[PDB]
Design a protein around this motif. Structure first.
Motif, PDB file in Angstrom:
ATOM      1  N   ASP A  84      31.800  50.730  31.902  1.00  0.00           N
ATOM      2  CA  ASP A  84      32.647  50.862  33.085  1.00  0.00           C
ATOM      3  C   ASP A  84      32.879  49.501  33.726  1.00  0.00           C
ATOM      4  OD1 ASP A  84      33.521  53.546  33.455  1.00  0.00           O
ATOM      5  OD2 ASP A  84      31.504  54.143  34.103  1.00  0.00           O
ATOM      6  N   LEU A  85      34.075  49.303  34.267  1.00  0.00           N
ATOM      7  CA  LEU A  85      34.395  48.129  35.072  1.00  0.00           C
ATOM      8  C   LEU A  85      35.330  48.545  36.194  1.00  0.00           C
ATOM      9  CD1 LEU A  85      34.887  45.103  35.914  1.00  0.00           C
ATOM     10  CD2 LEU A  85      36.453  44.950  33.975  1.00  0.00           C
ATOM     11  N   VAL A  87      36.817  47.348  40.428  1.00  0.00           N
ATOM     12  CA  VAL A  87      36.834  46.507  41.613  1.00  0.00           C
ATOM     13  C   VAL A  87      37.372  47.339  42.773  1.00  0.00           C
ATOM     14  CG1 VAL A  87      37.799  44.432  42.700  1.00  0.00           C
ATOM     15  CG2 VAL A  87      37.153  44.392  40.270  1.00  0.00           C
ATOM     16  N   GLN A  92      41.035  44.156  44.659  1.00  0.00           N
ATOM     17  CA  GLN A  92      41.580  43.994  43.323  1.00  0.00           C
ATOM     18  C   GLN A  92      42.623  42.885  43.316  1.00  0.00           C
ATOM     19  OE1 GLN A  92      42.954  47.831  42.026  1.00  0.00           O
ATOM     20  NE2 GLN A  92      40.922  48.776  42.208  1.00  0.00           N
ATOM     21  N   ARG A  93      42.988  42.424  42.120  1.00  0.00           N
ATOM     22  CA  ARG A  93      44.025  41.408  41.947  1.00  0.00           C
ATOM     23  C   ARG A  93      43.668  40.082  42.619  1.00  0.00           C
ATOM     24  NH1 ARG A  93      46.367  44.964  45.328  1.00  0.00           N
ATOM     25  NH2 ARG A  93      45.243  46.807  44.548  1.00  0.00           N
ATOM     26  N   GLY A  95      40.880  38.121  41.129  1.00  0.00           N
ATOM     27  CA  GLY A  95      40.107  37.370  40.163  1.00  0.00           C
ATOM     28  C   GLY A  95      38.691  37.868  39.961  1.00  0.00           C
ATOM     29  N   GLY A  97      37.580  40.923  38.693  1.00  0.00           N
ATOM     30  CA  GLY A  97      37.450  41.516  37.370  1.00  0.00           C
ATOM     31  C   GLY A  97      37.250  40.455  36.299  1.00  0.00           C
ATOM     32  N   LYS A  98      38.085  39.418  36.328  1.00  0.00           N
ATOM     33  CA  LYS A  98      37.963  38.311  35.382  1.00  0.00           C
ATOM     34  C   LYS A  98      36.601  37.618  35.472  1.00  0.00           C
ATOM     35  CE  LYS A  98      42.812  37.126  34.771  1.00  0.00           C
ATOM     36  NZ  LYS A  98      43.921  36.185  35.088  1.00  0.00           N
ATOM     37  N   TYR A 126      47.759  49.348  33.462  1.00  0.00           N
ATOM     38  CA  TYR A 126      47.228  48.294  34.306  1.00  0.00           C
ATOM     39  C   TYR A 126      45.897  47.789  33.760  1.00  0.00           C
ATOM     40  CZ  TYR A 126      50.944  49.251  37.653  1.00  0.00           C
ATOM     41  OH  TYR A 126      52.175  49.396  38.257  1.00  0.00           O
ATOM     42  N   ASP A 129      46.759  45.688  30.692  1.00  0.00           N
ATOM     43  CA  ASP A 129      47.242  44.389  31.136  1.00  0.00           C
ATOM     44  C   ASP A 129      46.097  43.504  31.628  1.00  0.00           C
ATOM     45  OD1 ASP A 129      49.819  45.118  30.489  1.00  0.00           O
ATOM     46  OD2 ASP A 129      50.433  45.521  32.567  1.00  0.00           O
ATOM     47  N   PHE A 130      45.111  44.104  32.291  1.00  0.00           N
ATOM     48  CA  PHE A 130      43.964  43.318  32.732  1.00  0.00           C
ATOM     49  C   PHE A 130      43.167  42.776  31.553  1.00  0.00           C
ATOM     50  CE2 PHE A 130      39.375  43.116  33.402  1.00  0.00           C
ATOM     51  CZ  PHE A 130      39.316  42.053  34.279  1.00  0.00           C
ATOM     52  N   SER A 133      44.619  39.980  29.712  1.00  0.00           N
ATOM     53  CA  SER A 133      44.592  38.716  30.443  1.00  0.00           C
ATOM     54  C   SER A 133      43.232  38.024  30.382  1.00  0.00           C
ATOM     55  CB  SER A 133      44.975  38.932  31.906  1.00  0.00           C
ATOM     56  OG  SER A 133      43.870  39.397  32.663  1.00  0.00           O
TER      57      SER A 133
HETATM   58  C1  MLC Z   1      40.959  46.859  36.232  1.00  0.00           C
HETATM   59  C2  MLC Z   1      40.249  46.061  37.329  1.00  0.00           C
HETATM   60  C3  MLC Z   1      38.734  46.168  37.103  1.00  0.00           C
HETATM   61  C4  MLC Z   1      40.680  44.613  37.119  1.00  0.00           C
HETATM   62  O1  MLC Z   1      40.075  43.635  37.967  1.00  0.00           O
HETATM   63  P1  MLC Z   1      40.886  42.963  39.177  1.00  0.00           P
HETATM   64  O2  MLC Z   1      41.755  43.927  39.889  1.00  0.00           O
HETATM   65  O3  MLC Z   1      39.883  42.183  39.932  1.00  0.00           O
HETATM   66  O4  MLC Z   1      41.940  41.875  38.561  1.00  0.00           O
HETATM   67  P2  MLC Z   1      41.582  40.322  38.469  1.00  0.00           P
HETATM   68  O5  MLC Z   1      42.579  39.524  39.210  1.00  0.00           O
HETATM   69  O6  MLC Z   1      40.490  39.723  37.668  1.00  0.00           O
HETATM   70  O7  MLC Z   1      42.446  40.280  37.024  1.00  0.00           O
HETATM   71  C5  MLC Z   1      43.752  39.680  37.126  1.00  0.00           C
HETATM   72  C6  MLC Z   1      45.085  40.162  36.419  1.00  0.00           C
HETATM   73  O8  MLC Z   1      45.116  41.702  36.185  1.00  0.00           O
HETATM   74  C7  MLC Z   1      46.450  42.269  35.739  1.00  0.00           C
HETATM   75  N1  MLC Z   1      47.407  42.125  36.904  1.00  0.00           N
HETATM   76  C8  MLC Z   1      48.059  41.538  37.931  1.00  0.00           C
HETATM   77  N2  MLC Z   1      48.648  42.430  38.705  1.00  0.00           N
HETATM   78  C9  MLC Z   1      48.345  43.615  38.219  1.00  0.00           C
HETATM   79  C10 MLC Z   1      48.701  44.819  38.650  1.00  0.00           C
HETATM   80  N3  MLC Z   1      49.473  44.836  39.729  1.00  0.00           N
HETATM   81  N4  MLC Z   1      48.304  45.932  38.038  1.00  0.00           N
HETATM   82  C11 MLC Z   1      47.488  45.787  36.916  1.00  0.00           C
HETATM   83  N5  MLC Z   1      47.127  44.518  36.477  1.00  0.00           N
HETATM   84  C12 MLC Z   1      47.563  43.439  37.149  1.00  0.00           C
HETATM   85  C13 MLC Z   1      46.788  40.892  35.351  1.00  0.00           C
HETATM   86  O9  MLC Z   1      46.483  40.528  33.983  1.00  0.00           O
HETATM   87  C14 MLC Z   1      46.431  39.733  36.484  1.00  0.00           C
HETATM   88  O10 MLC Z   1      46.352  38.522  35.702  1.00  0.00           O
HETATM   89  P3  MLC Z   1      47.370  37.295  35.657  1.00  0.00           P
HETATM   90  O11 MLC Z   1      47.796  37.127  37.050  1.00  0.00           O
HETATM   91  O12 MLC Z   1      46.599  36.180  35.076  1.00  0.00           O
HETATM   92  O13 MLC Z   1      48.382  37.849  34.727  1.00  0.00           O
HETATM   93  C15 MLC Z   1      40.603  46.602  38.733  1.00  0.00           C
HETATM   94  O14 MLC Z   1      42.016  46.542  38.933  1.00  0.00           O
HETATM   95  C16 MLC Z   1      40.118  48.056  38.844  1.00  0.00           C
HETATM   96  O15 MLC Z   1      39.042  48.314  39.369  1.00  0.00           O
HETATM   97  N6  MLC Z   1      40.957  49.016  38.414  1.00  0.00           N
HETATM   98  C17 MLC Z   1      40.549  50.425  38.495  1.00  0.00           C
HETATM   99  C18 MLC Z   1      40.609  51.052  37.086  1.00  0.00           C
HETATM  100  C19 MLC Z   1      39.739  50.297  36.060  1.00  0.00           C
HETATM  101  O16 MLC Z   1      38.970  49.405  36.403  1.00  0.00           O
HETATM  102  N7  MLC Z   1      39.902  50.720  34.791  1.00  0.00           N
HETATM  103  C20 MLC Z   1      39.227  50.218  33.566  1.00  0.00           C
HETATM  104  C21 MLC Z   1      38.298  51.208  32.830  1.00  0.00           C
HETATM  105  S1  MLC Z   1      36.730  51.736  33.626  1.00  0.00           S
HETATM  106  C22 MLC Z   1      36.725  53.473  33.317  1.00  0.00           C
HETATM  107  O17 MLC Z   1      35.999  54.063  32.515  1.00  0.00           O
HETATM  108  C23 MLC Z   1      37.827  54.199  34.089  1.00  0.00           C
HETATM  109  C24 MLC Z   1      37.926  55.659  33.687  1.00  0.00           C
HETATM  110  O18 MLC Z   1      38.462  55.886  32.584  1.00  0.00           O
HETATM  111  O19 MLC Z   1      37.488  56.512  34.492  1.00  0.00           O
END
Ligand code: MLC
Ligand code: COA
Ligand code: MG
Ligand code: MG
Ligand code: MG
Ligand code: MG
Ligand code: MG
Lengths: 150, 150
Positions: A84-85, A87, A92-93, A95, A97-98, A126, A129-130, A133
């Motif tokens: 699991d991961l 934020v 979110q968005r 840095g 997650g990275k 989404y 895409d994460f 990246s």
């Molecule tokens: C997915 C995340 C962990 C990602 O981390 P962050 O949000 O901190 O993002 P962060 O800035 O490091 O990463 C940066 C970049 O994310 C993508 N980026 C930018 N805008 C975005 C947007 N609007 N929507 C989606 N991605 C976007 C880009 O590549 C941007 O990079 P650049 O700008 O360089 O292009 C979070 O958004 C989150 O908690 N999402 C909830 C769902 C989730 O985490 N799902 C994963 C499976 S866990 C699981 O098991 C879920 C389940 O199935 O129940």
């Protein structure tokens, strides 16, 4: 920015573990969730094949990930499975997650692991895409089968 | 096959484990493979989160699968991860794969597990047809990312 801290949880970190589980609950929108007892969570945290990383702003858990170690028979260099991961929706968005992924791979690198892998549902644009990246070595299309047991 | 036996390996079953790994090498057509030291493989077999099932005719392993226990923080009931499954090419399509899957899920039901899951590559048509005949609860399209570490 640098106020953000990444911490690998240890065995005296149960409250932070529970905090992360609560974060998972909100971000994944889990309904009617009943958290397992602390006895069970502590024993999990105590396993040598399980590693939790959290992201912190002072003492706020604002993100985190869980991972399992899979010892191989093909090699003596283990595998790490990121399960699991997440934020916090309000962080979110930015840095986090990275930084979590980076720290995680860095940790398993120091430990001499062969490879870390993580999965996302094909419909989760989404998430895809994460992960794309985070410059993974490669990605593969796969089909996940499960058996709900009686 | 009414001489076929399905057996869950115990700690003293290293020779059978090695035999299954060589079966994996042959069937998966792995090239330039070096099997790990026995002491490594013996420790893995000793783990209580790792379970191997094999299919036997007389002393001959003709198939088998490996599985990992993934303890959960969402529930007290663990998940099981089927990692590899193969049947000797001379013995394929005779029900061995099904019996293995059956025995595995039966074992994990008796242990109070929530769920067993397994993954096949999208291009692996024969693997996909197999799993889709084992009455899985569901199937999901998934993207798998990995990081090859230095
Ligand atoms: C997915 C995340 C962990 C990602 O981390 P962050 O949000 O901190 O993002 P962060 O800035 O490091 O990463 C940066 C970049 O994310 C993508 N980026 C930018 N805008 C975005 C947007 N609007 N929507 C989606 N991605 C976007 C880009 O590549 C941007 O990079 P650049 O700008 O360089 O292009 C979070 O958004 C989150 O908690 N999402 C909830 C769902 C989730 O985490 N799902 C994963 C499976 S866990 C699981 O098991 C879920 C389940 O199935 O129940
Ligand atoms: C895939 C594999 C493990 C299957 O085991 P198996 O013993 O050959 O399969 P079973 O005999 O138990 O199959 C029961 C049936 O499942 C589905 N099935 C299995 N093999 C199939 C095939 N090759 N083509 C189409 N359907 C198949 C069928 O319904 C077959 O049933 P039927 O023969 O009564 O119609 C084996 O063929 C193998 O080791 N293949 C190469 C390695 C591999 O792909 N491993 C899995 C990677 S994810
Ligand atoms: Mg700590
Ligand atoms: Mg050679
Ligand atoms: Mg060695
Ligand atoms: Mg043991
Ligand atoms: Mg059929």
């Amino acid at each position: 920015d640098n106020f953000l801290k990444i911490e690998r949880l240890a065995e005296n970190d149960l409250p932070k573990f529970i905090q992360l589980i609560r974060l998972f609950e909100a971000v994944f929108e889990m309904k009617n969730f009943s958290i397992p007892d602390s006895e069970h969570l502590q024993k999990l945290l105590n396993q040598n094949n399980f590693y939790v990383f959290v992201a912190l702003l002072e003492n706020k858990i604002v993100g985190g990930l869980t991972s399992y170690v899979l010892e191989q028979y093909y090699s003596e260099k283990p595998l790490a499975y990121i399960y699991d991961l997440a934020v916090d929706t309000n962080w979110q968005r930015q840095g986090i997650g990275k930084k979590l992924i980076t720290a995680t791979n860095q940790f398993y690198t120091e430990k001499g692991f062969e490879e870390v892998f993580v999965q996302a549902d094909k419909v989760d644009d989404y998430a895809l895409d994460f992960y794309r990246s985070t410059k993974p070595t490669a990605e593969e299309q796969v089909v996940h089968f499960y058996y709900t047991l009686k």
